[model samples]
Target chain A: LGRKLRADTMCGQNATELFCFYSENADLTCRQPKCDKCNAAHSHLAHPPSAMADSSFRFPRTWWQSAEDVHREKIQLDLEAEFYFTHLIMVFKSPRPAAMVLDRSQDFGKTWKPYKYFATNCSATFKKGAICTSRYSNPFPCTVIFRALSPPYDIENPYSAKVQEQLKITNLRVRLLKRQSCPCQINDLNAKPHHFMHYAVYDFIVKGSCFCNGHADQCLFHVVHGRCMCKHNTAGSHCQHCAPLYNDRPWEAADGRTGA
Target chain B: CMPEFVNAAFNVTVVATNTCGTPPEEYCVQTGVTGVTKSCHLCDAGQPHLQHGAAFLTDYNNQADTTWWQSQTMLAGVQYPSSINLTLHLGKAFDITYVRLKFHTSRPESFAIYKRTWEDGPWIPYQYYSGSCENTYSKANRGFIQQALCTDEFSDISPLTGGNVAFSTLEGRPSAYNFDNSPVLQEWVTATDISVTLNRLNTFGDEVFNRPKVLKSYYYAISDFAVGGRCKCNGHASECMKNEFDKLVCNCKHNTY
Candidate 1:
């Protein structure tokens, strides 16, 4: 119905626990107000573990590991409810210190399915590839992004000073065609060894429309109506297309069977 | 003629007494502590109440004493086996529904309460295992509010009988989420009376050993104490008039009764 979605909302305000750290040492806990860059022992506190999805760039040590680490590390988000989220914006700290893949579930983590994956060719020419899906299965919504920092991507300064070029999506904004829910548990995992698997993130944002969870086409934006009443005629998804005996279309204005 | 706001009726006298074994009161302040002093204005029936009582603390070097009500035993400057009995008596009869106390302790604590309709009636007690006062009573302890309301129809308070009774049946222990293993679902037999007693129990059960353990210290103290409930308003049954927050204020002074 043309309503503006929550394209810039802070999706991780209530995220509680952080999970799937590469090991106990890498699993730094999150704190509130975020610590300043001072306090050395707890400077990481400045970046809450939840900051990865908090939609702010005040980095929370965006999850990394050593070259001795594995490659298939995962980070999961357990939402409070089965929310209808349309897209995600994952802002990585550096470039592709590690490749990230997004996965989610609506069944409270009983099972998970891939949602989106990210990879970048970090060089003088930085290119990224993304894949998203649209399917509504379970109820509880969660996201577990896998990090795999492979070759062709140097661990140190993956991208040279030749930044700001192609689709090197350090800042990712994904749109979901499913429902959005609050995450009860959010987890992070370490992956295969690199000189360093420092996959830092500046911010993470997920956008959605409050009024149109799954019924975006059936409801009106702001106004309380559904499927836009056609005055008098049977129509399609937006009640715009003529249903044979119907006769209205987006391009063909005011064309109805009764017009004859 | 004088306006209807007649300054009439009698005045009530409220006295807080504590049994310190030797003397009626003991005002012992820690040595190395700053701003550690006492005043009655903070522990009175009016103005300020629940003045800080010195901690019947076991540690001699403990400087954390936020005043309310305090009493401790010191035989030749050394603490030993001791018991404290703090008492309060209200002139008239009243129906009490609420009881709130504030104290500080890392572990759980046990205290007792006794009251009756007439002053001469046999003493009856309701033992209480209090929740942690760690946060409620701070170093700058003014005391916080912890409410426990027991309605009439609920619970199995059948086998219990007394003239003015209030009883609580131990139902459940503190869960993992609740670190303070405070007692829950304590109820009063009947909410009418006069005398109130706060006796620190010498022995309490330990969670680790699953057996009762005697208290290591022979002292007890509090900054403030309050006795509240329903009283006569226009000669009818009503709560002891209070200032919005339920802090017992005065009787119903409405005229033209």
Candidate 2:
């Protein structure tokens, strides 16, 4: 996978295409040899519009666009362009169907419910901030995943994710859990003997984080040197964390950029 | 008396794949590029059996007389022999790059190299892809081992690595006998008594010393295109060209970087 065609053919004949890399830490992404650096972090290669001159990036020339006589007062770009530039979605699949999370929550004696949604297709979508009802209403498992809507890469809609891949039954086993259903849970934040374990099951493409999909009680952060520094909030392995205060209610302050 | 190693016959199977552990004969077939196929029977080599009326290619008829040398490139191979006669035609001059000859029912084949300037006097070992010369006679690993008699199969080689070069399992590789495309050179149609030819050369003449490159292979990601061939020819309505919508059949011509 380390092989890259862009580097090989870019300067040779055609050096025109959209190329961007968000993550600077190449080591964290490209763990496989024979793989290109771009594969380390998700990227895209798009052909620019025809109106964009082939000689578009002449720094000094680009600054004085009026001299080139190529003038455009307004540029209309799609919402996706800016969106892809910021966010990358990762998919997780576990063959060994374990319910450590639900079992742990049961031990806490918190009455909960499990609902199943008829996935329209083999691939399911997991969106953020999607709400479901406590009653056995027509819409259940309304939001199939647990991910953040702000901070890091603020991707709100999990419904666009290709995570609900068909649950195939091989010798391997797999199971799905509801959103925010902590891998390990406890009753109240200030309740007696409250405890929630952050566990990443053995075997699977696990990296970048330990537990971020809302394991509330005591979040575990896989720190440097492979240490699970149980930092009540650090969810990702890359120190990708938000203090309880920052994440508990980050959205409540959205007042249209009023200096509140 | 000769040792008990007589009346003995052995056969070996050839496997095709990138992970084909044993180094079997391989050919490369590129997409978009068409090729012609040819084949023959095994030649007998007990005593000096000269081909009476076989068409053999001699020198380039002198430099510039290159009607046979198409792209100035050539590929060659031979059927290993103790002593034999070979005649090739060439235009300019180059070194004889590589040669492989295999002998069955091996009696420990052996020999030397010889070449000549003209067709007459003292023969000497031809210097390079240029000049007239003979090749080193080999034993164990000779030309391609005949699988079936007169059978020619041509298709895209497995896209494990991106060397669109199809795999050819032809036995003899002569300078003047270069194949136009990747063709199976086996006589499958007419199965007569298993016989052999004396000095076998392919279509390519001289300049046949290129190496089999380890390439980055590619394949198409197509799902469905159930249209028949009689409808149109250049493959189905791919999104490559909007105007060329469904104007033909369905084919995914492999990528070429």
Candidate 3:
């Protein structure tokens, strides 16, 4: 049941975040804004409106002016706002990665849209000619940055839609690939946020040492928007694929071809 | 000055009134130009959507990579129900106009927003298109999203249903066209199961790291979920000896040839 995990940023253990429904109510002013005629002194909202203009960036925003500057400004602010925004990883019942559709307007301006067909992912650099450790014959000390950005948002959010229209990339091993880096401009949803997507942090605590230092050979890093993979284990980004080797004979390590 | 007050969309009434006396029988025969609605060509599934693009060059000569290509960029970070313009070599009649995405294998497949064109776009919203097609989910599990075959009536309303990629201009104007890719719902995370992955990693990478310095795992197979340890350790030990599948075995042996 115990396995090792590798990832970028800081590492934690037995860590997980759950997406649960909370019944806590906020102050009237702090709650989401709703519009309606208020005859009484303090009545409920007229309508359950949102800051996103519409559920899916439709309605109001879309109907707003199509001036280039308007969208451009929104895109810039969005980038700043987005980079600063903290995406949550909700652990649904029965621990698993939640699915999310990606959104463009949320990242770009409302006018900026997505294309059904475009290469969102497709970057990987496999480290060839790696050496295995003498102590552990297996690709010891193998360094794979496992763990992917958290599950995407809901449909109401643009990121949600993008997450949905995505292709799930899986890997049998951990990934040494770098997380989101470069930033690109997409409008007409014209550009692509494929390799450079940002925000999807998760929380976890360390379970134990995977002693994953052998083969410390660099794990491969291949990226495509549709999927995510682990360099070592396909499971969690960091040792997400770190599975338990039960009664069966373990693969050889530095002693032989054993690697797990 | 900018063409004087023109008809709102396009008016066929003014044209008819100019040539023949309004409602004249003779004029009917003269202006008997039948509305020659041309059927657009349909494309088959898996249409080739290759585009012209330049590969990142090393020395800035643009020679290290690409020469020429029509390119397509899918920005998953954009709003749903987006649009992409297929710019073809002008004068050359376009046949299969479907935009092919250089899809990443690991990505998901759905969005609610709609796609529109740049020059001719600000296309239709996702709501409009969803209405055109009966919920596709009912028939097929939303595997990979196909904007073209979104609805049943889509094929019927326009020759586009044929799945061809040829799109005529708006209002029958022969201008270039643009379509939308709308985001419909939540995006799914392609999480790898550590259980299933452990085995795959061993076979492919053939390398292991982060070993429990003091802890060695002894995995026991559960023939039946209920009977945890009851099932025979029958083939367990023998299989271990036969296949050498145990990591715990090393702990038992300690040293070997």
Q: Which predicted model would earn the best TM-score?
A: 1
Instruction: State, as a TM-score between 0 and 1, how close model 3 is to the true structure.
Output: 0.16
Give the poorly placed runs of model 1, Cα more than 4 Å off: A1-38, A41-260, B1-67, B74-83, B104-108, B128-200, B203-218, B232-257
Query: In terms of docking quality, how is candidate 2 classified?
Result: incorrect
TM-score (0 to 1) of chain B, per candidate?
0.38, 0.18, 0.18
Best by DockQ: 3
Native contact share for candidate 1 = 0.00
Q: Please give the ranking of all candidate structures by lDDT, highest first, separated by commas.
A: 1, 2, 3
Question: Model 2 off-target regions past 4 Å?
Answer: A1-260, B1-85, B88-122, B126-257
**C-alpha lDDT (0 to 100) for residue A255 of candidate 2:** 16
List model 1 lDDT by residue over B54-145, tens digit each. 22211122234433334443222222122343433443444333343333211112244555545656554533332221212111111122
Q: lDDT of each model, Cα atoms only?
A: 0.29, 0.19, 0.19
- Models 1 onward score TM values of 0.27, 0.14, 0.16
Listed per model in order, the count of residue pairs whose N, CA or C atoms clash below 3 Å is 62, 78, 157
Candidate 2 lDDT over A8-78, as tens digits, reads 11110232222211111223231111111111122122221221222222222100001111111111121
lDDT of 3 by residue, A142-239 (tens): 10111112212221222212332231211111111222211112221444222111222211211112222233333231111112233333233222
Q: What's the residue-level lDDT of B140 in candidate 1? A: 17
Candidate 1, residue B167: Cα displacement in angstroms equals 9.8
